[PDB]
Design an enzyme around this catalytic site. Structure first.
Site, short mmCIF file in Angstrom:
data_model
loop_
_atom_site.label_atom_id
_atom_site.label_comp_id
_atom_site.label_asym_id
_atom_site.label_seq_id
_atom_site.Cartn_x
_atom_site.Cartn_y
_atom_site.Cartn_z
N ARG A 54 23.94 40.11 16.25
CA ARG A 54 22.65 39.99 16.87
C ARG A 54 21.62 40.63 16.00
O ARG A 54 21.61 41.85 15.83
CB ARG A 54 22.66 40.59 18.25
CG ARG A 54 21.33 40.50 18.94
CD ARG A 54 21.44 40.65 20.43
NE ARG A 54 21.12 41.95 20.74
CZ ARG A 54 20.06 42.45 21.39
NH1 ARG A 54 19.09 41.73 21.86
NH2 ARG A 54 20.01 43.78 21.55
N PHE A 59 12.59 43.79 14.79
CA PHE A 59 13.14 44.63 15.83
C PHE A 59 14.33 45.44 15.31
O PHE A 59 14.18 46.65 14.99
CB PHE A 59 13.52 43.79 17.09
CG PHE A 59 14.11 44.56 18.25
CD1 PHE A 59 14.02 45.97 18.38
CD2 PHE A 59 14.80 43.84 19.27
CE1 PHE A 59 14.60 46.60 19.47
CE2 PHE A 59 15.39 44.49 20.34
CZ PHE A 59 15.23 45.84 20.49
N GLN A 62 21.96 44.32 14.80
CA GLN A 62 23.03 44.90 15.68
C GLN A 62 24.43 44.43 15.21
O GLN A 62 24.66 43.26 14.90
CB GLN A 62 22.80 44.55 17.14
CG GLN A 62 23.82 45.14 18.14
CD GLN A 62 23.41 44.92 19.57
OE1 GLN A 62 22.22 44.76 19.85
NE2 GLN A 62 24.36 45.01 20.49
N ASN A 101 24.17 49.81 24.05
CA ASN A 101 24.94 50.13 25.24
C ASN A 101 24.71 49.11 26.32
O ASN A 101 23.91 48.15 26.12
CB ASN A 101 24.66 51.56 25.71
CG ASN A 101 23.26 51.76 26.19
OD1 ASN A 101 22.76 51.00 26.99
ND2 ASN A 101 22.63 52.84 25.76
N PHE A 112 23.05 49.72 16.23
CA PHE A 112 21.94 48.98 15.62
C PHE A 112 21.16 49.81 14.62
O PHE A 112 21.15 51.02 14.74
CB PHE A 112 21.00 48.33 16.68
CG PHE A 112 20.31 49.29 17.61
CD1 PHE A 112 20.95 49.85 18.73
CD2 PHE A 112 19.00 49.66 17.40
CE1 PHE A 112 20.23 50.65 19.60
CE2 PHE A 112 18.31 50.44 18.26
CZ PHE A 112 18.95 51.02 19.33
N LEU A 121 13.11 52.76 23.46
CA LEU A 121 14.52 53.06 23.64
C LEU A 121 14.88 54.55 23.74
O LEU A 121 16.04 54.92 23.97
CB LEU A 121 15.32 52.38 22.56
CG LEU A 121 15.12 50.85 22.45
CD1 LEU A 121 15.94 50.35 21.25
CD2 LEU A 121 15.56 50.12 23.73
N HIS A 125 19.10 55.09 24.45
CA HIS A 125 20.08 54.82 23.41
C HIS A 125 20.17 56.08 22.57
O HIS A 125 19.11 56.67 22.27
CB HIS A 125 19.62 53.68 22.56
CG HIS A 125 19.60 52.40 23.33
ND1 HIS A 125 20.68 51.54 23.35
CD2 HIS A 125 18.72 51.93 24.26
CE1 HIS A 125 20.42 50.54 24.17
NE2 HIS A 125 19.24 50.74 24.74
C1 LIG Z 1 18.71 47.24 20.63
C2 LIG Z 1 20.09 47.36 21.14
O1 LIG Z 1 19.98 46.83 22.47
C3 LIG Z 1 21.15 46.90 23.33
O2 LIG Z 1 22.07 47.77 23.38
C4 LIG Z 1 21.18 45.76 24.33
N1 LIG Z 1 22.50 45.78 25.00
C5 LIG Z 1 23.63 45.32 24.29
O3 LIG Z 1 23.53 44.72 23.26
N2 LIG Z 1 24.84 45.56 24.93
C6 LIG Z 1 26.07 45.13 24.17
C7 LIG Z 1 27.12 46.14 24.60
C8 LIG Z 1 28.07 45.77 25.55
C9 LIG Z 1 29.03 46.71 25.98
C10 LIG Z 1 29.06 48.05 25.48
N3 LIG Z 1 29.93 49.08 25.83
C11 LIG Z 1 30.93 49.19 26.76
C12 LIG Z 1 31.27 48.15 27.81
O4 LIG Z 1 31.61 50.24 26.78
C13 LIG Z 1 28.09 48.37 24.48
C14 LIG Z 1 27.12 47.44 24.08
#
Ligand SMILES: CCOC(=O)CNC(=O)NCc1ccc(NC(C)=O)cc1
Ligand SMILES: [K+]
Ligand SMILES: [K+]
Length: 164
Positions: A54, A59, A62, A101, A112, A121, A125
């Protein structure tokens, strides 16, 4: 001192170069240690061979979902998830390294690298490091993203590890 780690990144099998990151073990030791160990592969799993899944221009970039390669997976060296260590460090500009997260206390392996200031954030985060070298490489990765976050080329951490 704080760990210095690296990610060697390709785009469809062509090298973009090396991102060097400092991990702020002095402020977030548990979060730092998780990332460090996932770079070395010393627990028998980690980032080598996984992707930036991603990438959103203007921005962040990731990565870290080394199980499902799409944002649904990853795991930490501790177990599947671990708590938010602290929010001492802030999303102050480009080159900040921070944990992705799915809500409070859901850190795993996804992370990221910011390509702008992402202060919205802060307190949500866990920031745990920054780019020492290779912001130009980050900018290259950023160039293969899109506003949807889908990448136009397969972006692969071909190698990674610890320099000091
Ligand atoms: C800019 C970054 O924005 C974000 O974090 C948006 N949310 C995201 O991408 N979530 C993906 C993710 C999905 C599960 C976990 N963990 C767990 C389940 O233990 C950690 C990250
Ligand atoms: K936006
Ligand atoms: K290595």
């Amino acid at each position: 001192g704080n760990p210095l780690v690296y990610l060697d990144v390709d785009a469809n099998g062509k090298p973009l170069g090396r991102v060097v990151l400092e991990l702020k073990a002095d402020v977030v030791p548990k979060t730092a240690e998780n990332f460090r160990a996932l770079c070395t592969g010393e627990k028998g799993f980690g980032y080598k061979g996984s992707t930036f899944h991603r990438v959103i221009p203007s921005f962040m970039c990731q990565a870290g979902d080394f199980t499902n390669h799409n944002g649904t997976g990853g795991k930490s060296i501790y177990g599947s998830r671990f708590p938010d260590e602290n929010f001492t460090l802030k999303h102050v500009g480009p080159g900040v390294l921070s944990m992705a997260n799915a809500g409070p206390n859901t850190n795993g392996s996804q992370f990221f690298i910011c390509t702008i200031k992402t202060d919205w954030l802060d307190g949500k985060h866990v920031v745990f490091g920054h780019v020492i070298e290779g912001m130009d490489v980050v900018k290259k990765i950023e160039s293969f993203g899109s506003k949807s976050g889908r990448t136009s080329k397969k972006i692969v951490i071909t190698d990674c590890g610890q320099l000091s």
